[PDB]
Amino acid sequence: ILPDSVDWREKGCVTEVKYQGSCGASWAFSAVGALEAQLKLKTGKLVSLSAQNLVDCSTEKYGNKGCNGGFMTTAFQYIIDNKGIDSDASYPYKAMDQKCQYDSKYRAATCSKYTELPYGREDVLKEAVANKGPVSVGVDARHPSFFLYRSGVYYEPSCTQNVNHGVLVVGYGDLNGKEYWLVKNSWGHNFGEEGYIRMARNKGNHCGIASFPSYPEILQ
Numbered sequence: 001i002l003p004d005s006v007d008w009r010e011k012g013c014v015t016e017v018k019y020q021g022s023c024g025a026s027w028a029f030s031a032v033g034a035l036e037a038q039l040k041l042k043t044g045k046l047v048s049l050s051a052q053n054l055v056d057c058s059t060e061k062y063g064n065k066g067c068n069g070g071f072m073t074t075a076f077q078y079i080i081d082n083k084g085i086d087s088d089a090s091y092p093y094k095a096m097d098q099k100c101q102y103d104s105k106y107r108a109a110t111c112s113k114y115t116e117l118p119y120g121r122e123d124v125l126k127e128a129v130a131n132k133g134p135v136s137v138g139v140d141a142r143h144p145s146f147f148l149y150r151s152g153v154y155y156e157p158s159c160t161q162n163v164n165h166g167v168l169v170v171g172y173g174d175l176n177g178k179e180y181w182l183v184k185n186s187w188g189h190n191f192g193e194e195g196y197i198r199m200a201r202n203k204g205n206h207c208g209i210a211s212f213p214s215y216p217e218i219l220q
């Protein structure tokens with residue numbers, strides 16, 4: 001059976017909320033966020049990974065268009081093919097498309113593999129958050145209510161299962177009967193609950209939370 005709540009921030013596996021700005025790089029933040037937890041698990045050290053490095057280098061070959069959109073899965077592939085990703089401190093985020101500046105001497109993480117989960121299976125997503133770590137997902141964030149969210153379990157009746165915004169599920173729980181997912185966003189600390197949104201869980205793949213989940217792995 002499975003725990004009723006998880007919160008990977010309680011285990012020191014989640015870095016500070018980031019601020020993506022004008023650049024549509026939510027997918028890159030989603031991807032490094034998921035790897036950051038796998039890295040802390042392996043090495044005991046928590047270090048922010050370079051979303052910029054994903055924006056600049058995981059490009060045409062991986063189906064990504066930097067600040068105009070991308071995929072977490074093909075971001076994980078880039079890190080696999082590239083044999084590393086830099087630390088955020090060495091390759092800081094600039095919220096704009098740049099030429100690729102990966103330097104292997106400031107390699108902060110590796111990626112061995114990644115796994116995609118079945119569309120719409122929130123029980124499968126729940127198991128992965130418990131047993132594997134935080135999971136990269138997309139959500140439907142194209143609703144005034146999403147931007148305006150300040151607290152509580154977010155439920156948007158007009159939300160769809162088509163995803164357009166990359167985020168990280170770092171836990172799940174329940175708030176007085178309302179089951180939720182704990183979601184790390186990349187809109188700074190002034191968004192929602194210090195940068196987190198708790199989204200409706202077990203409500204028919206609400207906002208496409210479980211439409212396209214994936215999580216990376218660092219072996220050995």
Ligand SMILES: CC(C)(C)C1CCN(CCCn2nc(-c3ccc(C(F)(F)F)c(CNCc4ccc(F)cc4)c3)c3c2CCN(S(C)(=O)=O)C3)CC1
Nearest residue numbers: 027063064065068069070071137138162163164165166212
């Ligand atoms: C590259 C390769 C090998 C051919 C892959 C083929 C498999 N796969 C595509 C299909 C799976 N998939 N993945 C996503 C998916 C997952 C996460 C996210 C994110 F929000 F987190 F960012 C997004 C949003 N960004 C889209 C974006 C991508 C590149 C760009 F430039 C510009 C924008 C989409 C979707 C689908 C299906 C269609 N939809 S939809 C409306 O929801 O049905 C979305 C990824 C590419």
